[PDB]
Amino acid sequence: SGQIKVLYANKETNSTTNTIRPWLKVVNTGSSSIDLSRVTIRYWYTVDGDRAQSAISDWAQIGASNVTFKFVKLSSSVSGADYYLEIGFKSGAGQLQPGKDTGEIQIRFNKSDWSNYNQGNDWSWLQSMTSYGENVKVTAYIDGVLVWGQEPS
Numbered sequence: 001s002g003q004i005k006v007l008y009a010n011k012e013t014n015s016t017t018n019t020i021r022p023w024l025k026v027v028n029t030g031s032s033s034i035d036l037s038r039v040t041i042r043y044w045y046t047v048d049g050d051r052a053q054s055a056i057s058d059w060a061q062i063g064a065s066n067v068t069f070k071f072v073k074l075s076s077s078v079s080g081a082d083y084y085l086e087i088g089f090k091s092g093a094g095q096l097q098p099g100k101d102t103g104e105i106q107i108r109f110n111k112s113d114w115s116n117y118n119q120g121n122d123w124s125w126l127q128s129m130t131s132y133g134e135n136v137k138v139t140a141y142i143d144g145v146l147v148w149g150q151e152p153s
């Protein structure tokens with residue numbers, strides 16, 4: 001079936017920033033292996049003045065090229081989100097075995113005019129978790145089914 005945890009490291013402590021930096025990791029905590037292509041992660045936030053947006057992995061243990069990004073503007077705003085960044089994995093990311101993790105996934109994202117975000121009104125931001133921990137407001141899915149975290153209400 002599939003059991004996972006997502007770990008999170010905030011690499012931008014300034015609330016005001018042109019670059020959100022939610023580093024991530026997927027841990028397979030169940031008993032079967034999981035194809036990482038089946039896994040999606042969502043970082044829910046408020047855009048703070050809508051613009052084109054770009055997300056980049058500068059480096060990932062599984063190979064940055066294997067990380068996919070999709071910005072989704074939410075149909076309706078919810079508490080601390082009008083967008084999410086959906087992080088996914090190509091076949092090249094491969095399989096996560098029981099008890100193992102992806103290792104580090106670096107992520108940054110910015111608006112195309114480098115205008116500032118405010119991270120303080122972001123559902124998924126955890127300012128102080130600057131090393132890898134459990135940020136339950138970054139949610140994760142297997143085949144589109146929520147398996148980790150709390151989506152914004």
Ligand SMILES: [Ca+2]
Binds near residue numbers: 047117119120121122
């Ligand atoms: Ca915001």
